[PDB]
Design a protein around this ligand. Sequence first.
Ligand SMILES: *[C@@H]1O[C@H](CO)[C@@H](O)[C@H](O)[C@H]1NC(C)=O
Ligand SMILES: *[C@@H]1O[C@H](CO)[C@@H](O)[C@H](O)[C@H]1NC(C)=O
Lengths: 49, 49
Amino acid sequence: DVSDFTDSVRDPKTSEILDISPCSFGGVSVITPGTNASSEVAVLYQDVN
Amino acid sequence: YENQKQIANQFNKAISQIQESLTTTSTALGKLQDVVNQNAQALNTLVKQ
Ligand SMILES: *[C@@H]1O[C@H](CO)[C@@H](O)[C@H](O)[C@H]1NC(C)=O
Ligand SMILES: *[C@@H]1O[C@H](CO)[C@@H](O)[C@H](O)[C@H]1NC(C)=O
């Protein structure tokens, strides 16, 4: 890749070409009504199905 | 009021000319393109490093 990470590999036993993708990562945001109002929150997981 | 027809006609003709100038070719929207480029140049150096 352009940032010098390997993205494709060849299997050393069966000679099959494999693509490599990252495991899921992202940011987490916490949405709150206010501590004085309530103790509940909602969670937003960013950039994920 | 005494010249309303002429004013209406040249208003419509001016809108038609603006539409043609946007249709054929436009560097007039360069400023919105210039904003787009310096962001993409900013990230390409971040991945390069
Ligand atoms: C390597 O061994 C596996 C099973 O042990 C076999 O399926 C594969 O064909 C072998 N590869 C080569 C290049 O001999
Ligand atoms: C998320 O994944 C599920 C199961 O793989 C799929 O049914 C759904 O359409 C996906 N949503 C997207 C890609 O927006």
